[PDB]
Every structure is written in structure tokens, then in C-alpha cells.
Scaffold this active site. Structure first.
Site, PDB file in Angstrom:
ATOM      1  N   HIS A  41       0.883  -1.419   0.178  1.00 19.62           N
ATOM      2  CA  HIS A  41      -0.077   0.023  -0.179  1.00 19.62           C
ATOM      3  C   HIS A  41       0.898   1.457   0.099  1.00 19.62           C
ATOM      4  O   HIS A  41       2.158   1.290   0.257  1.00 19.62           O
ATOM      5  CB  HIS A  41      -1.033  -0.054   1.119  1.00 19.62           C
ATOM      6  CG  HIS A  41      -0.523   0.475   2.388  1.00 19.62           C
ATOM      7  ND1 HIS A  41      -1.110   1.210   3.360  1.00 19.62           N
ATOM      8  CD2 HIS A  41       0.742   0.370   3.237  1.00 19.62           C
ATOM      9  CE1 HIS A  41      -0.352   1.514   4.429  1.00 19.62           C
ATOM     10  NE2 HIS A  41       0.509   0.703   4.282  1.00 19.62           N
ATOM     11  N   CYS A  95       3.615   5.624   5.487  1.00 20.35           N
ATOM     12  CA  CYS A  95       3.771   4.458   6.405  1.00 20.35           C
ATOM     13  C   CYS A  95       5.208   3.920   6.377  1.00 20.35           C
ATOM     14  O   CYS A  95       5.872   4.116   5.426  1.00 20.35           O
ATOM     15  CB  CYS A  95       2.771   3.173   5.834  1.00 20.35           C
ATOM     16  SG  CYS A  95       2.730   1.574   6.526  1.00 20.35           S
ATOM     17  N   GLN A 113      -7.602  -2.810   9.532  1.00 22.08           N
ATOM     18  CA  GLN A 113      -8.446  -1.709   9.649  1.00 22.08           C
ATOM     19  C   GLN A 113      -9.844  -2.304   8.649  1.00 22.08           C
ATOM     20  O   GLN A 113      -9.163  -2.644   7.662  1.00 22.08           O
ATOM     21  CB  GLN A 113      -8.384  -0.453   9.582  1.00 22.08           C
ATOM     22  CG  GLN A 113      -7.318   0.194  10.524  1.00 22.08           C
ATOM     23  CD  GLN A 113      -7.038   1.575  10.388  1.00 22.08           C
ATOM     24  OE1 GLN A 113      -8.023   2.395  10.848  1.00 22.08           O
ATOM     25  NE2 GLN A 113      -6.059   1.990   9.890  1.00 22.08           N
ATOM     26  N   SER A 136      -6.406   5.607   9.604  1.00 19.24           N
ATOM     27  CA  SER A 136      -4.894   6.151   9.183  1.00 19.24           C
ATOM     28  C   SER A 136      -4.781   7.053   8.312  1.00 19.24           C
ATOM     29  O   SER A 136      -3.910   8.047   8.344  1.00 19.24           O
ATOM     30  CB  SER A 136      -3.962   4.894   8.735  1.00 19.24           C
ATOM     31  OG  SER A 136      -4.189   3.845   9.689  1.00 19.24           O
ATOM     32  N   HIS A 139      -5.497   5.305   1.342  1.00 20.64           N
ATOM     33  CA  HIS A 139      -4.620   4.395   0.644  1.00 20.64           C
ATOM     34  C   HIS A 139      -4.774   4.108  -0.681  1.00 20.64           C
ATOM     35  O   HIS A 139      -5.646   4.181  -1.050  1.00 20.64           O
ATOM     36  CB  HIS A 139      -4.837   2.786   1.465  1.00 20.64           C
ATOM     37  CG  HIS A 139      -4.693   3.065   3.143  1.00 20.64           C
ATOM     38  ND1 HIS A 139      -3.896   2.697   3.749  1.00 20.64           N
ATOM     39  CD2 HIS A 139      -5.710   3.414   3.873  1.00 20.64           C
ATOM     40  CE1 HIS A 139      -3.962   2.771   5.037  1.00 20.64           C
ATOM     41  NE2 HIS A 139      -5.357   3.455   5.287  1.00 20.64           N
TER      42      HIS A 139
HETATM   43  O1  LIG Z   1       8.199  -6.558   6.808  1.00 24.63           O
HETATM   44  C1  LIG Z   1       7.658  -6.174   5.875  1.00 24.63           C
HETATM   45  C2  LIG Z   1       7.297  -7.172   4.715  1.00 24.63           C
HETATM   46  C3  LIG Z   1       7.167  -8.607   5.192  1.00 24.63           C
HETATM   47  C4  LIG Z   1       7.483  -9.613   4.055  1.00 24.63           C
HETATM   48  O2  LIG Z   1       6.624  -9.755   3.219  1.00 24.63           O
HETATM   49  N1  LIG Z   1       7.312  -4.935   5.712  1.00 24.63           N
HETATM   50  C5  LIG Z   1       7.896  -3.810   6.484  1.00 24.63           C
HETATM   51  C6  LIG Z   1       6.861  -3.564   7.288  1.00 24.63           C
HETATM   52  C7  LIG Z   1       5.489  -4.031   7.187  1.00 24.63           C
HETATM   53  C8  LIG Z   1       4.419  -3.396   7.696  1.00 24.63           C
HETATM   54  C9  LIG Z   1       4.443  -2.271   8.588  1.00 24.63           C
HETATM   55  F1  LIG Z   1       3.341  -1.753   9.255  1.00 24.63           F
HETATM   56  C10 LIG Z   1       5.666  -1.538   8.727  1.00 24.63           C
HETATM   57  C11 LIG Z   1       6.652  -2.020   7.837  1.00 24.63           C
END
Ligand SMILES: O=C(CCCO)NCc1ccc(F)cc1
Length: 145
Positions: A41, A95, A113, A136, A139
Site C-alpha cells: 500500500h 507508512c 482496519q 490512518s 490508501h
Molecule cells: O516486513 C515487511 C514485509 C514482510 C515480508 O513480506 N514490511 C515492513 C513493514 C510492514 C508493515 C508495516 F506496518 C511496517 C513495515
């Protein structure tokens, strides 16, 4: 006539198109559930976001209308091929997942959400949403798996 989708008419051209009221996607062609999906996203926050702060800006002050304009502009560039979703997410998503080209990994129902979850599960693999609103911010969602 798949669920979530409806026929509509272009105001400017008069040609029929299709609109999904769960994902806010729109397209010209007639449109074509798993435990989990994987999405990326691009989030644009605004002054009424749950936390109006991000790695890009300590104090996010843009209005919700301004945030929607930015989202619309990114969608245009992605659809034209002028920019890649991953490139815009890395540069401009409010984000922390921007660092991962927007990738959130995989998730089930009951974790995200609700408007984000509903849009994510209604996208087909490879499909991208229109503007999706949550507490938030706004998106753009790309379903990758
Ligand atoms: O760790 C991953 C991808 C995992 C493997 O597909 N992304 C970092 C991230 C994810 C969600 C967030 F809210 C903040 C950072």
C-alpha cells in the site's frame, strides 16, 4: 455481474465503465475467498489521521482533500506507466512500510482496519484499488498474492 461491481456511464465520453464500491477501482472492461492475501500500500496521511505524523513529516498538516488529490495523482501516474507503484510507495508513503516498497506481507481477516481488509480481499491478484479511506488516512492498495 460480479458482487462489488456496478455498471456506470462516463460523464465526459458517455461510454460504459465498471466501478467497484468496495475497492473504489474503476475500469473500462467488464470485470473478471482465500484465508490470507498479501498486499502493498501507499498511505497518504492528513490532519485527521489517527496519528498525524510519519517518517516523512513530524507534523502532517495537509487536509483530507489535499491527501485525496495526492492519491489521485499517484493513481494516474501508476495507470499511465509513468511511475511504478513500488517507486511511489518507497518515496511518498506515510507508512513505515515505504521502506519495503509498501509491502505489508500476508494477513487474514480480522487484522487490518476493516475498509482496508475489505478492499484487500475484494481485489483480484495483481489488481490495484482506488482511494481507500481508513482512520490512518487514504490508501492505494496493491494485492500481490
Ligand atoms: O516486513 C515487511 C514485509 C514482510 C515480508 O513480506 N514490511 C515492513 C513493514 C510492514 C508493515 C508495516 F506496518 C511496517 C513495515
Amino acid at each position: 455481474l460480479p458482487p462489488g461491481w456496478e455498471k456506470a456511464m462516463s460523464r465526459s465520453s458517455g461510454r460504459v465503465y465498471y466501478f467497484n464500491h468496495i475497492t473504489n477501482a474503476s475500469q473500462w472492461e467488464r470485470p473478471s475467498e482465500p484465508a490470507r492475501v498479501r498486499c502493498s500500500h501507499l498511505l497518504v496521511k492528513h490532519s485527521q489521521s489517527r496519528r498525524p505524523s510519519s517518517w516523512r513529516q513530524e507534523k502532517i498538516t495537509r487536509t483530507k482533500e489535499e491527501a485525496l488529490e495526492l492519491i489521485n495523482g499517484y493513481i494516474q501516474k501508476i495507470k499511465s506507466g509513468e511511475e511504478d507503484f513500488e517507486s511511489l510507495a518507497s518515496q511518498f508513503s506515510d507508512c513505515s512500510s515505504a521502506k519495503a516498497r509498501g509491502d505489508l506481507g500476508a494477513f487474514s481477516r480480522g487484522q487490518m482496519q476493516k475498509p482496508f481488509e475489505d478492499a484487500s480481499f475484494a481485489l483480484r491478484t495483481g489488481e490495484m484499488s482506488g482511494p481507500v479511506f481508513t482512520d490512518s488516512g487514504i490508501h492505494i492498495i496493491l494485492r500481490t498474492e
